[PDB]
Design a protein around this ligand. Structure first.
Ligand SMILES: N[C@@H](Cc1c[nH]c2ccccc12)C(=O)O
Ligand SMILES: CC(C)=CCSP(=O)(O)OP(=O)(O)O
Ligand SMILES: [Cl-]
Ligand SMILES: [Zn+2]
Ligand SMILES: [Zn+2]
Length: 362
C-alpha cells in the first residue's frame, strides 16, 4: 500500500468522523484537538515511518474504543508516544506527554511523577514503555490516561516491579488484591499498570493481568469474587466472544483490578477483556459474536455497527485485526461493554500477542 497521509491526519479524520457519529458535539471537537496535540510529536510520519506499536496488534499506534453500555456514548483513543526510527522503548516521547497534558489540559501528574523514574527509565527491557489515551462523553471534560508496562525489568520481574510502583504511590497495603487475582501461578501474570491522570477522588490505579492457557472456567474463577461477576454470565460471554471455544489457547485472556476500588464495595473493581483477533477466521465472524451478545439491546448494536462502519476500511471477511478487544463489566440496564478497534494501518490478521511482541520474543 502506498501511504499518502500522516498517521496523525488519517487517525484524526477517523476520530472526528466517529465523534460525529456518536453526537459528541463540541466536546468531540475538543477531543480531536487533544488527539492532535498528543500526536504532534509524530511529525510527518506515515505508518511506515513509526516503529511498530503495541497499541493495536498489527503495529498501528492508535486504538479506538467505544462504550456500548447504557450511558450516553463515550469515545476513547489510546496511542503510543513514538518517533520515527527511535526504538519504542526509548522513554523521551512518553516523558514529554505528561507536561503537555498537565500544562494544556490540567491533567494531574502526581502519581505519574511518582512512577516515571521507575517505569520510564532509559534502559527498559521490553519493546514498549507507554501508552496514553483520552476518553470523552458529550458535554463532559476529557479524561486522560497513562499505561505503563510491567516488563520494564524483564519478563519475570513484573511482580517485583509492580510492588515497587505501589511503594512509590504509598499503596503497598493493596498487595493482597494483586496476589489473590493470581489463581494459577506462572500463568496469571500482571503486565500493565494504568493511571487516570486526574486529582478527582475517583481517579483509578489499575493493574492488568494476562491469563495464559486458561479455560473459560478459570477466567470466571478469577473474576467471581468481584461484585457482579456472576460466573455463568462471565463464562457465557467468553464463549460467545470466542465462538464456543473453551480455552484461551494462544492469546491470553485479560482482566484488570482497580486497586482503590477493591476494598470499597462500591464500584466493582474488575473488568474482563476478551481478545478478538486470534479466535476467529475474520472480523465478519467477530461482528456476529458482538451482535449475539448485544441482541437484547438494539441501541447498543446500532451504535456498534455505526462506529465499525467508519473505522473498517476493507471487507470484514478478509481476515481479523479490526477488532482488538471487547470488555465486560456488570451494568445497570445491560452489561457495560467497550469495543476496541484498530485503524489497521498494517497487515490483516495479526499474530497472537502482536507483530511487535512477536518480533521481540523472536
Ligand atoms: N495491544 C496490547 C495493549 C493493549 C491495547 N489495548 C488493550 C486493551 C486491553 C488489553 C490490552 C490492550 C495488548 O494486547 O496487550
Ligand atoms: C490498555 C488500553 C489501551 C485500554 C484498556 S483500559 P480502558 O481505560 O479502555 O478501560 P476502562 O474504560 O477503564 O474500562
Ligand atoms: Cl501517486
Ligand atoms: Zn503513487
Ligand atoms: Zn517515510
Amino acid at each position: 500500500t502506498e501511504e499518502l497521509t500522516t498517521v496523525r491526519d488519517a487517525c484524526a479524520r477517523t476520530l472526528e468522523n466517529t465523534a460525529r457519529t456518536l453526537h459528541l458535539g463540541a466536546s468531540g471537537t475538543e477531543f480531536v484537538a487533544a488527539f492532535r496535540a498528543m500526536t504532534d510529536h509524530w511529525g510527518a510520519a506515515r505508518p511506515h515511518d513509526l516503529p511498530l506499536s503495541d497499541v493495536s496488534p498489527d503495529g498501528s499506534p492508535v486504538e479506538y474504543a467505544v462504550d456500548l453500555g447504557g450511558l450516553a456514548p463515550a469515545l476513547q483513543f489510546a496511542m503510543e508516544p513514538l518517533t520515527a526510527g527511535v526504538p519504542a522503548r526509548d522513554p523521551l516521547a512518553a516523558r514529554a506527554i505528561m507536561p503537555l497534558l498537565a500544562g494544556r489540559y490540567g491533567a494531574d501528574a502526581t502519581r505519574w511523577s511518582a512512577l516515571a523514574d521507575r517505569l520510564l527509565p532509559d534502559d527498559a527491557h521490553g519493546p514498549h514503555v507507554s501508552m496514553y489515551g483520552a476518553e470523552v462523553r458529550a458535554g463532559a471534560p476529557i479524561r486522560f490516561k497513562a499505561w505503563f508496562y510491567l516488563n520494564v525489568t524483564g519478563p519475570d520481574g513484573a511482580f517485583n516491579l509492580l510492588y515497587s510502583a505501589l511503594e512509590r504511590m504509598g499503596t503497598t497495603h493493596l498487595w493482597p488484591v494483586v496476589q489473590a487475582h493470581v489463581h494459577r501461578a506462572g500463568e496469571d501474570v500482571p503486565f500493565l499498570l494504568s493511571l487516570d491522570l486526574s486529582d478527582d477522588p475517583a481517579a483509578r490505579v489499575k493493574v492488568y493481568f494476562r491469563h495464559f492457557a486458561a479455560d473459560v472456567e478459570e477466567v470466571a474463577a478469577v473474576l467471581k469474587a468481584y461484585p457482579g461477576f456472576e460466573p455463568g454470565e462471565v463464562r457465557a460471554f467468553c464463549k460467545v466472544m470466542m465462538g464456543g471455544r473453551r480455552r484461551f489457547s494462544d492469546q491470553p485472556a485479560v482482566t484488570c483490578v482497580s486497586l482503590l476500588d477493591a476494598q470499597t464495595f462500591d464500584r466493582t473493581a474488575a473488568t474482563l477483556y476478551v481478545p478478538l483477533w486470534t479466535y476467529a477466521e475474520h472480523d465478519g465472524e467477530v461482528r456476529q459474536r458482538v451482535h449475539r451478545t448485544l441482541a437484547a439491546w438494539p441501541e447498543a448494536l446500532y451504535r456498534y455497527d455505526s462506529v465499525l462502519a467508519g473505522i473498517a476500511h476493507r471487507g470484514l471477511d478478509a481476515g481479523t485485526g479490526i477488532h482488538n478487544y471487547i470488555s465486560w463489566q456488570p451494568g445497570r440496564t445491560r452489561p457495560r461493554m467497550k469495543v476496541y478497534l484498530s485503524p489497521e494501518m498494517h497487515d490483516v490478521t495479526p499474530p497472537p500477542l502482536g507483530v511487535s511482541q512477536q518480533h521481540h520474543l523472536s
